[PDB]
Amino acid sequence: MRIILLGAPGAGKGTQAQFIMEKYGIPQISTGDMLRAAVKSGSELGKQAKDIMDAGKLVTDELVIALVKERIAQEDCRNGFLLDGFPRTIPQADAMKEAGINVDYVLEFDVPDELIVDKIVGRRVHAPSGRVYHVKFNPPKVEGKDDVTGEELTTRKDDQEETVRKRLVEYHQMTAPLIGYYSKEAEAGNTKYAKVDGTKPVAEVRADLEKILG
Template structure:
């Protein structure tokens, strides 16, 4: 864990993470700002030396948050937590919030911040009871109010903001396909953007399905150019305050994806000071 410890203790200038992060990490909020106990069940805060990383991954729809967050979770041994999965799990579980969530979803409304934080806090408390230490949150918080609530409940160490050229992002979203038999996710887009005015080009190979899935691919009904562009516009508008919230606290890492996974993964590990960690883990396997 030496690489992870280095990251928390000292962020390099290239990460755009200021030294204030180290001073602000793990500081408890006053009880006057704590959320009502009937809504939140946050686990007790731990000293950083007694737990693993607590990170957030942000980025536009289709940028690959889930892919990179999941890979990092497997590498450093922490759970990958996506709030969308928590909502779907609660709906399927017939738990105390199931009927309320079902009504919200059926009416096409947004799930309230209180419910999302409650589900998240319960998930973290359950994980801690099982011996989990640390996590990577995928795509949350999405709004400034969610970020402010989260700040009172959990100590976030680092926020990784994944970015991708809009041309590539649009092509990725329009190239998404799902196998209607096995449920596998694939992408038929072959992205080859030429560099201009000294800027580097970008190539992203398609993620094609096996032959037996090829004839069963379907496109999401909302993956049209007009819908995707509007979705990206709304995200960019809502994300700016969240990014500034964490930037002002010295916790934001802006990472521009240079291409697909083969090009981006080693550079992301390098930016996170985890490149040697993967090498040591592979050698010890």
């Protein structure tokens, strides 16, 4: 099975990745992982990608697509692949089509913005050790303090509410046309598309995916 799995930053689409990998015998692949790998390999695309990154420049859609095409030709994608978080824009989806990269299912892992925010801004960390807590889901033993040292917990700059909300605003303005793109592709019979309710318990989402995919 060839699957694209999309989802807003913080929604938790990753919670279903291992289920999909084990159901079908397929690797999880991502443009981030591809960039890091091809550089190691010394292949020509990797060298081109390394040059671009070393210059602090943007990886063009042309190069990303060539890396995707190369990645899915590798032996471990024989049964399919779980393409995580890509495409991100209609131009990238069109470049997939120009290159001949169709998939069987596009899954939109959907969690309302307010629930994403509530999840992230409740996080607490003991930064010297990377130990993590959450006011609502994994609270510490003494309020606001690290269990092990007793030092007062903090929050990551990455997790500030204004920063989370800005990231979601940007995500939806980019992704809304892409969702419509794949819905239309499904209407044409070129793929299947499903909006997945990520707010349910993990075990229920898993059951729902089993019905969506078969």
